[PDB]
Amino acid sequence: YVYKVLKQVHPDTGISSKAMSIMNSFVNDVFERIAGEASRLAHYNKRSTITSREIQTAVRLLLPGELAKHAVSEGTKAVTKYTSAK
């Protein structure tokens, strides 16, 4: 998946196995941090379900200004599109 995204942004660029290993550590790290925040967020609100809403708040709490804004838009857009598919 990292390779697919790479080709979209730099069609004519590869990536060494070590760099790929670093990218894999990065995705897992961000996943855990976002999920952790969502987890506590749910518990603080006595909610047993993690929805796109907790994930969104978790993203606002975790990411720096500009990255949050764009992450949120991509997340919102993907859920809206996903929800519109019959």
């Binding site: 506590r40 967020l41 603080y44 907790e54 708040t57 606002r60 709490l61």
Partner: protein, 74 residues
């Protein structure tokens, strides 16, 4: 946040002599500190759909800023 209050803080910190410019420097730091914490506190507030910032919202914000605070719930 007045000169005498900043000076009192410095004293509890064991500071003996204070430069004139310290006082605007402190205000700037305090502001950055509050901004960061409140931003998170307010984010927990909105998430819970309240219009009132609770002690817990502040406590949770302090905690994940790595500034855990005891005495206000949790």
């Amino acid at each position: 946040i007045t000169k005498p209050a900043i000076r009192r803080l410095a004293r509890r910190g064991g500071v003996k002599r204070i430069s004139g410019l310290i006082y605007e420097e402190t205000r700037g730091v305090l502001k950055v500190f509050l901004e960061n914490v409140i931003r998170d506190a307010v984010t927990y507030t909105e998430h819970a759909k309240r219009k009132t910032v609770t002690a817990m919202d502040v406590v949770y914000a302090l905690k994940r800023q790595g500034r855990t605070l005891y005495g206000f719930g949790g």
